[PDB]
Automatic annotation (TrEMBL):
The keyword Hydrolase applies. NCBIfam families: bla_class_A, blaCTX-M. Belongs to the class-A beta-lactamase family. This is Beta-lactamase. Keywords: Antibiotic resistance, Disulfide bond, Hydrolase, Plasmid, Signal. Gene3D superfamilies: DD-peptidase/beta-lactamase superfamily. The gene is blaCTX-M-14. Residues 19-234 form the Beta-lactamase class A catalytic domain.
Length: 260
């Protein structure tokens, strides 16, 4: 099709590998580019950890208010929110918000611990029908993004379908789904990625991710003005381990998608 020719050209101009999945919830059409190739998730995996904890709170009604210690030993490489609360506590709700809206890596590791390890996050993916998602490591090593390494990867198609179920479907209870949507809409790290390629009137909830090999990711639920919402996943990774992030590529992919 036309969009796929433009995405391929975008990819060729960028020198990396681009994976795109769009689900238009209006007619459940999908637009896929390398939709079944694995990409390193990096911080986009935080959505699954947060959703898994939300799923637990459907039974444990007070779980999100449970205080969790933040100790100096918990801090890893990027902890913009957790650093503000070292030797104090944050609730699981506050940790989920920090993981999603600030990409706080300590918050992610606490969520993983709450779920019983990476295997507990992966289990939740399986429980909602995602057989592709796999979380193997904690922060920060899940971001190594080594070419060909299947660890901590998913495919654009799988992540799009799963993000649709979490935010627009009924994989979570209504209060949990609304909380997830509110968190994503309050993301602070996404201004230069998918959002930058979309009309400013469209409301976006997204989670970015970045890692080694210039890996630059964004997954988004998009509410266009007077139109059915869209789910857009854009993964991008590059051949050089030290390559710089290319958020502009995600913005351009979104722009190409939005033209249709």
């Amino acid at each position: 099709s036309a969009v796929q020719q433009k995405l391929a050209a975008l990819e060729k101009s960028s020198g990396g590998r681009l994976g795109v999945a769009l689900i238009d919830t209006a007619d459940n059409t999908q637009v896929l580019y390398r939709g079944d190739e694995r990409f390193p998730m990096c911080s986009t995996s935080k959505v699954m950890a947060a959703a898994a904890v939300l799923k637990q709170s459907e039974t444990q009604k007070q779980l999100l208010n449970q205080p969790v210690e933040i100790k100096p030993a918990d801090l890893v490489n990027y902890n913009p929110i957790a650093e503000k609360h070292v030797n104090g506590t944050m609730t699981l709700a506050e940790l989920s918000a920090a993981a999603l809206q600030y990409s706080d890596n300590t918050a992610m590791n606490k969520l993983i611990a709450q779920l019983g390890g990476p295997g507990g996050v992966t289990a939740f993916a399986r429980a909602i029908g995602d057989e592709t998602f796999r979380l193997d490591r904690t922060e920060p090593t899940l971001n190594t993004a080594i070419p060909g390494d299947p660890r901590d990867t998913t495919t654009p198609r799988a992540m799009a379908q799963t993000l649709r179920q979490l935010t627009l479907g009924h994989a979570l209870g209504e209060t949990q789904r609304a909380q997830l949507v509110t968190w994503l809409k309050g993301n602070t790290t996404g201004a230069a990625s998918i959002r930058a390629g979309l009309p400013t009137s469209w409301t976006v909830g997204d989670k970015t991710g970045s890692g080694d090999y210039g890996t630059t990711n964004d997954i988004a639920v998009i509410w266009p003005q007077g139109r059915a919402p869209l789910v857009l996943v854009t993964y991008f990774t590059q051949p050089q381990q030290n390559a710089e992030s290319r958020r502009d590529v995600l913005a351009s992919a979104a722009r190409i998608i939005a033209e249709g």
